[PDB]
């Protein structure tokens, strides 16, 4: 059976894009890779050291 809707009506703000200027949150890009899960792994030793050199200190 296909019942008629009778529940909650949400409120929504459309975004032309999200968090563009921020460092955290979420990005809404379409992925060009075959996998919508594409993400490379990060670990110690990649470039010779165990420390993160992006840290300002």
């Amino acid at each position: 059976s296909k019942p008629t809707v009778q529940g909650k009506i949400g409120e929504c703000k459309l975004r032309g894009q999200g968090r563009m200027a921020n460092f955290d949150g979420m990005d809404m890009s379409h992925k060009m890779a075959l996998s919508s899960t594409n993400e490379i792994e990060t670990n110690e030793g990649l470039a010779g050291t165990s420390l993160d050199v992006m840290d300002l200190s």
Partner: peptide, 8 residues
């Protein structure tokens, strides 16, 4: 109906 909407 309500029941079906819920399960859906």
């Amino acid at each position: 109906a309500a029941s079906e909407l819920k399960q859906l």
